[PDB]
Ligand binder design. Structure first.
Ligand SMILES: CCOc1c(Cl)cc(N2CCCCC2)cc1NC(=O)c1cc(C)c(OCCN)c(C)c1
Length: 247
């Protein structure tokens, strides 16, 4: 997250921190996620497409810090890693960039809700806020494009939803942005998602409810004029999500 503020898990109790273990015993941070039901985290396929081995992954919930323990945090293995079959990437765009991680504690259980671990609601079919609406993002992603390490403390910021019309102009993204995507940016280009933020939530307060409007997907750089963050339009993927989450 370029700009914005540091935060704690209690402010974003649905955010999942997803790591990869390596041969040798090192663990790295992969991407964020959102808890959508006690057994299911939802994230981005491009985070996992090169390494689809569910065994390699660790999911934390209730976690505020990158490399240390937070009180009340829970550790999960990935029982089922489900990638969208029509995923693909172009120069810039990722398409159908959505994934489900079915989770389980070492004792065989799904998430137990607490003050620091809660689910985030899904939107209804083709039901998004109007452009100009403020929404929040959360992540351990880079704080500046030049960094090579991620922040140790979770972050958030508030960005504004951008119309498809503005997003698909030539100097923005042309036809690279589709209807199954959503753009959001700072009007002054000062805050943004950035590498490492992928897979995490774009949350919009919709009709008196905290709603998973987006999943961090792609962009051209971070906080660049005329280059908004691009997010998966979760409201266009409910038959996909329901289909894989029923069993
Ligand atoms: C086309 C590359 O896609 C990919 C692909 Cl295909 C793979 C990866 N990662 C591979 C290593 C393990 C984590 C996933 C990672 C990216 N993207 C980025 O590094 C990235 C992501 C975002 C969200 C960014 O911010 C844009 C939002 N304004 C930036 C600048 C880079």
């Amino acid at each position: 997250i370029i700009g914005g503020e540091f935060t704690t898990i209690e402010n974003q109790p649905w955010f999942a921190a997803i790591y990869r273990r390596h041969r040798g015993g090192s663990v790295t941070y992969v991407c964020g996620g959102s808890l959508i039901s006690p057994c299911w985290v939802i994230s981005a396929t491009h985070c996992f497409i090169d390494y689809p081995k569910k065994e390699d992954y660790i999911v934390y919930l209730g976690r505020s810090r990158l490399n240390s323990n937070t009180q009340g945090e829970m550790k999960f293995e990935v029982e089922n890693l489900i990638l969208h079959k029509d995923y693909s990437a172009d120069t810039l765009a990722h398409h159908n960039d959505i994934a489900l991680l079915k989770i389980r504690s070492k004792e065989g259980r799904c998430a137990q809700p607490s003050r620091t671990i809660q689910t985030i609601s899904l939107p209804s079919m083709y039901n998004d806020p109007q452009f100009g609406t403020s929404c929040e993002i959360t992540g351990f992603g880079k704080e500046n494009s030049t960094d090579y390490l991620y922040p140790e403390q979770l972050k958030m910021t508030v960005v504004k939803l951008i119309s498809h019309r503005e997003c698909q102009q030539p100097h923005y993204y042309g036809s690279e942005v589709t209807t199954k995507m959503l753009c959001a940016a700072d009007p002054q280009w000062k805050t943004d998602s950035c590498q490492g933020d992928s897979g995490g939530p774009l949350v919009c307060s919709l009709q008196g409810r905290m709603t998973l409007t987006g999943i961090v997907s792609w962009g051209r750089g971070c906080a660049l004029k005329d280059k908004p963050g691009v997010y998966t339009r979760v409201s266009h993927f409910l038959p996909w999500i329901r289909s894989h989450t029923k069993e």
